[PDB]
């Protein structure tokens, strides 16, 4: 049947669609600029926070997270990278100091302990079906005052 041709078309659309994302994903992978990634991360966080995509952490989730942090102390300057930066006057620079900071605050966050949404469907189905013209329009009158796709058109 000719329905087989339709199946070929939609598969073709899928494959090329994958190709476009592949090329776009490839190009982004090559760009490894610190600032470029830094801009992208901030924007992503803003959208996720704005959309509230991330579920709230119950008291249990906080307790387990705090337990692990206290258990390891992974977010203090005794870590390798922090110690190496500190001991060699590398953190005098602002940018590395921010990164060391950004680590530290994240650890601190984990350490913290008469009687007097359902979106409305305002389509016509939910309107009160109220019930009550041309001759009145005669009175207003009484006032006075795809073609050519394949052929020549």
């Amino acid at each position: 049947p000719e329905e087989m041709r339709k199946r070929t078309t939609e598969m073709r659309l899928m494959r090329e669609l994958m190709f476009r994302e592949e090329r776009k994903a490839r190009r982004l992978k090559k760009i490894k600029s610190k600032t470029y990634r830094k801009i992208k991360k901030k924007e992503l966080m803003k959208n996720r926070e704005l959309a509230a995509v991330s579920s709230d952490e119950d008291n249990e989730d906080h307790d387990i997270a705090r337990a692990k942090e206290r258990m390891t102390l992974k977010h203090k300057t005794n870590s390798k990278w922090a110690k190496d930066m500190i001991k060699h006057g590398m953190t005098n620079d602002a940018e590395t100091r921010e990164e060391m900071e950004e680590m530290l605050r994240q650890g601190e966050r984990l350490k913290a302990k008469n009687p007097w949404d359902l979106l409305l469907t305002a389509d016509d189905s939910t309107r009160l079906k109220i019930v009550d013209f041309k001759q009145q329009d005669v009175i207003a009158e009484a006032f006075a005052g795809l073609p050519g796709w394949g052929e020549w058109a």
């Binding site: 669609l17 959208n47 008469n114 979106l119 016509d124 009160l128 109220i130």
Partner: protein
């Protein structure tokens, strides 16, 4: 005026009266009030909107502080119980409460609550008349206990707010710090009455401070004690004695409901699909996709702003991506898994 009727859906883009427009003309009310009735029948919310609409139609029965202290606030404390961010619901509380007052004690109640006794009478009379046209044109003898109605449910409270936004879609204002944090620096010491707001479709001036709007003294939000809501509906603007534009609050609206209400209007535009972790374009078909977008509310000479991202169902109709439906976060997450399996 033609724009206003267009925003409310009365007129199409050709200035031609819509089926909604013809229905509004059957009411004696302003176009704004008629539209709220066009959305009020859902979940037996009709008496509440009638009470609100009648109260707004006849004017405020409340006596203001300037026109006149302890007995003043206890009365208001009673009628602001339904919601802490809704002046309109203060009107509803009074009107509905009046229905349960015996005829003999009514005059005592109105005086005791600093209520303009007459205006209440027209509201009840107008509440009866609107009740009559509705039942007469939907199917009529109306008796006084028909006006008696019980407290709205929390769901109904949410529906009523959006319902009102339909009649006041064009009168949404956003806190200035959200749009221009540099220009609008809010501190914890800042009085609520002095928190700037910006209305939608306000003419962009060289100085954005010129577009700032501030809350009325009469509003409960001055006594709220915490930060006001992000978005606010207003009825009218008044010029304060200090040359400060002053707004009469109606009620607050959340971001996602606002987008839904503006969707059927011309206020809402959709950005391109977002990308990143969590947010990804699930492609059902060459003509179908599910994705997150950033709705923009408002109409580069007017002040519009972007709303919270929302999951939407998009279809490629005539080569353009058209939003069919909104989707909850759970539904979108389930969709993503359904594609993976």
């Amino acid at each position: 005026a033609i724009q206003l009727l267009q925003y409310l859906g009365a007129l199409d883009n050709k200035e031609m009266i819509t089926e909604d427009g013809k229905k509004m003309s059957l009411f004696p009310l302003s176009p704004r009030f008629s539209k709220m009735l066009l959305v009020s029948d859902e979940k037996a919310c009709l008496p509440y909107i009638v009470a609100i609409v009648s109260a707004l139609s006849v004017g405020d029965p409340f006596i203001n502080e300037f026109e006149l202290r302890s007995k003043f606030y206890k009365s208001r404390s009673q009628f602001s119980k339904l919601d802490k961010f809704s002046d309109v619901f203060r009107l509803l509380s009074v009107v509905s409460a009046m229905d349960y007052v015996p005829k003999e004690q009514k005059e005592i109640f109105m005086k005791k609550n600093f209520l303009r006794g007459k205006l209440m009478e027209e509201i009840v009379k107008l509440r009866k008349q609107l009740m009559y046209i509705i039942k007469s044109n939907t199917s009529v003898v109306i008796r006084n206990e028909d006006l008696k109605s019980d407290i709205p449910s929390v769901i109904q409270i949410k529906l009523l707010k959006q319902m009102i936004c339909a009649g006041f879609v064009d009168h949404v204002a956003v806190r200035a710090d959200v749009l221009f944090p540099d220009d609008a620096k809010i501190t914890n010491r800042t009085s609520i009455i002095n928190i700037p707001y910006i209305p939608v479709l306000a003419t962009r001036t060289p100085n954005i401070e010129d577009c700032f709007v501030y809350i009325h003294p009469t509003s409960i939000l001055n006594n709220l004690g915490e930060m006001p809501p992000k978005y606010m509906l207003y009825y009218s603007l008044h010029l304060g004695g200090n040359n400060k534009t002053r707004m009469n609050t109606l009620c607050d609206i959340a971001s996602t409901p606002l987008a839904n209400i503006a969707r059927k209007g011309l206020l809402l535009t959709y950005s391109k699909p977002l990308t990143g972790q969590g947010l990804k374009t699930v492609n059902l078909s060459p003509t179908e996709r599910y994705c997150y977008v950033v709705p923009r509310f408002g109409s580069d000479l007017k002040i519009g702003w972007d709303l919270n991202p929302i999951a939407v169902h998009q279809k490629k109709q005539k080569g353009q991506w058209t939003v069919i439906k909104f989707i909850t976060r759970k539904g979108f997450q389930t969709i993503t898994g359904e594609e993976k399996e």
